Structures are given as structure tokens and as C-alpha cells.
Design an enzyme around this catalytic site. Structure first.
Site, PDB file in Angstrom:
ATOM      1  N   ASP A   6       4.763  -8.936 -13.694  1.00 61.41           N
ATOM      2  CA  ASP A   6       4.395  -9.776 -14.834  1.00 61.41           C
ATOM      3  C   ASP A   6       2.897 -10.053 -14.784  1.00 61.41           C
ATOM      4  OD1 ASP A   6       4.214 -11.491 -16.885  1.00 61.41           O
ATOM      5  OD2 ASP A   6       5.274 -13.166 -15.916  1.00 61.41           O
ATOM      6  N   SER A  55      -9.036  -7.208 -28.957  1.00 61.76           N
ATOM      7  CA  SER A  55      -8.851  -5.988 -29.724  1.00 61.76           C
ATOM      8  C   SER A  55      -9.793  -5.979 -30.916  1.00 61.76           C
ATOM      9  CB  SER A  55      -7.412  -5.881 -30.228  1.00 61.76           C
ATOM     10  OG  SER A  55      -7.223  -4.777 -31.095  1.00 61.76           O
TER      11      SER A  55
END
EC number: 3.4.23.22
Length: 330
Positions: A35, A199
Site C-alpha cells: 500500500d 498530472s
């Protein structure tokens, strides 16, 4: 040193991925959910409330000659999906894919929430976010990667998650045969303890790319891709009959649909998520309404590039003095 371990989807939807981890002496192998959105290595154990264990493999520290109780240490964690677990702490030897850390904090669950009990395939989590998020008190503990970093040939790990198929976590090296083209690296903020990056935008199917900054986290422990409501609306508007369902808890779409791809920007590069990756199947057994793999982050507080996004790429988690993230197509 290096390590390399295969990671395997837990079910036919890729709801999560499990990676075998050797703990203790003799080794006890547990299948952990790696994770990158959390920082605790915790396991079902011989200390876990018996009614909360249902098929998981347990760590028994009393059978490990290298286990040592970390005196006074406790841990307690809550995850973005509302699940939680807590317990006490041992140090022990932990190996992943041939890479061994001695003195790793292994957090032994005394209590786990129902969603962990109900998933027999996941024996615990191995956190790979930054150690500043580790919940051990009163002395915070380091992640497996943090403990191994100095020994690794290069201070990196890579996530190569498969679509409906196994993939690989590598530690200490970048497998240049595992991706196409070049790796595009992008800046990371560690201020929230996550692999947080920006992004450069997105496209829906064959549509034009929209240049827009989207701050989010690279989180192998989250199944879906959670993005701003504007972006998610623009995606689902291209799927006839798709709608946001408050009763279901997100966008659903006709199971008869063919989904468009979704592209996200990494610098000037582009990662294309094929449409099939966005299908998470019937909302309930036998339903013709299917759950979408791109969902709004509006109720979270952060955008999450979860497995749906990451499994379309070869992803480098660069733990150099200034961490960065790399993405390649594959």
C-alpha cells in the site's frame, strides 16, 4: 541488494493485489497488500480477536526466534474506505522477494474492522508511503522500504500491476525489460506523507487532451481512480446510460457498454488506461448495472491514482533524497 516479488490480484476484478512476505524465523509467509498510500506493516496474528479472523493466515510471534516485543508500542490506523485495525508491535526479520530487513516493525493486530475479517485473501498490509505517516506510538516506526533503502543498489521500488493477471514489485532496481519507451519522472511532494504528484491533464477515449493540473497520490492500496467531479463527469458522459447513483455510491453504467479509454498526463507523456480496466462488474450478483472504475474524489479531499491508473503503467517510486515518481507505458 535487491528484491523481486510477484503480486497477484485477489479476485477477478483486481479489487486488490497480494504479495507474499516472509516474517520471522523460521519464515512465516503471509500475503500482504502493498500500500503506497499508508505506512504501517500490520498483520493478522495470534493476538487478533478470534471472531475477527476468518480464513487469513496469521503471524505467531511466539514461534519466531527473532521476534521481540517492542515494549509499550501500540498502533491504530483508519483507512480512507472506513476500515481500521489496531494492536501492539514486534520487531522481526521481514523478507520480500529475497530482500531482507532485520528489526522491521511488524504491527500485530489485536482488532480489525469487519471489511478485513470478510476478506480472507489479505493477511495484512505493507505500507510504502513515507514513514511520517506511520501510526506506531510513542515511537514512530519506519517502513520496510525506509529500512531497506540504504542497502538497495538504487533507492527505489517499482510497481508493475497486472490487469487481470499477476505483476511485480521490485526493490532496488529498475527492470528495463518491463516497460516500453522511456520513463517520465515527475516531482513529488511529501508534505502529506504520500507519493503526491501533479498530472498534467487527461483525455477521454479518442478525444483531445485537456491540459490541466491534477494533484493526487499514487496509491497501490486503493482500487479505483478518484478524480475531480468535472473530469469524472466528462468521462461518463461518453458512456450511454451511465449515471451517478447515490444509492450505489458512485457512477454505474450498463454492463452491455463498451467503455472508452482514459488518458492521464505525466509531464509531456501520456498513460492510456484501456476502457476494460474501468469495468468493475455488476453492482450486485446478476445485475446488468456495472460499477465504474473512475469515480469522483469530491468527497475524499484528495485525488487518488489507484490501481485502475497504476496498472496501466510501470511506476517507479524513487526514494532518493528528493523523491520523485516515474511512469512508463508497458
Amino acid at each position: 541488494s535487491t528484491g523481486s516479488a510477484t503480486t497477484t490480484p485477489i479476485d477477478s476484478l483486481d479489487d486488490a493485489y497480494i504479495t507474499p512476505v516472509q516474517i520471522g524465523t523460521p519464515a512465516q509467509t503471509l500475503n500482504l497488500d502493498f500500500d503506497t498510500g499508508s505506512s504501517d506493516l500490520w498483520v493478522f496474528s495470534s493476538e487478533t480477536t478470534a471472531s475477527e479472523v476468518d480464513g487469513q493466515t496469521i503471524y505467531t510471534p511466539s514461534k519466531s526466534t527473532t521476534a521481540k516485543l517492542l515494549s509499550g508500542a501500540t498502533w491504530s490506523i483508519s483507512y480512507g474506505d472506513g476500515s481500521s485495525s489496531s494492536g501492539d508491535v514486534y520487531t522481526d526479520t521481514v523478507s520480500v522477494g529475497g530482500l531482507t530487513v532485520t528489526g522491521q516493525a511488524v504491527e500485530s493486530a489485536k482488532k480489525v474492522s469487519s471489511s478485513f475479517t470478510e476478506d480472507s485473501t489479505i493477511d495484512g498490509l505493507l505500507g510504502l508511503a513515507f514513514s511520517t505517516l506511520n501510526t506506531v506510538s510513542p515511537t514512530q516506526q519506519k517502513t520496510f522500504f525506509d529500512n531497506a533503502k540504504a542497502s538497495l543498489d538504487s533507492p527505489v521500488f517499482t510497481a508493475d500491476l497486472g490487469y487481470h493477471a499477476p505483476g511485480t514489485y521490485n526493490f532496488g532496481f529498475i527492470d528495463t525489460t518491463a516497460y516500453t519507451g522511456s520513463i517520465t519522472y515527475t516531482a513529488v511532494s511529501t508534505k502529506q506523507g504520500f507519493w503526491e504528484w501533479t498530472s498534467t491533464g487527461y483525455a477521454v477515449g479518442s478525444g483531445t487532451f485537456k491540459s490541466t493540473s491534477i494533484d493526487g497520490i499514487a496509491d497501490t492500496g486503493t482500487t479505483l481512480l478518484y478524480l475531480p467531479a468535472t473530469v469524472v463527469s466528462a468521462y461518463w458522459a461518453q458512456v450511454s446510460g451511465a449515471k451517478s447513483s447515490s444509492s450505489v455510491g458512485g457512477y454505474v453504467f450498463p454492463c452491455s457498454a463498451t467503455l472508452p479509454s482514459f488518458t492521464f498526463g505525466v509531464g509531456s507523456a501520456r498513460i492510456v488506461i484501456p476502457g476494460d480496466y474501468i469495468d468493475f462488474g455488476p453492482i450486485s450478483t446478476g445485475s446488468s448495472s456495472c460499477f465504474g472504475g473512475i469515480q469522483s474524489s469530491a468527497g475524499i479531499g484528495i485525488n487518488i491514482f489507484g490501481d485502475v491508473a497504476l496498472k496501466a503503467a510501470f511506476v517507479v517510486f524513487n526514494g532518493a533524497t528528493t523523491p520523485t515518481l516515474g511512469f512508463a507505458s508497458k
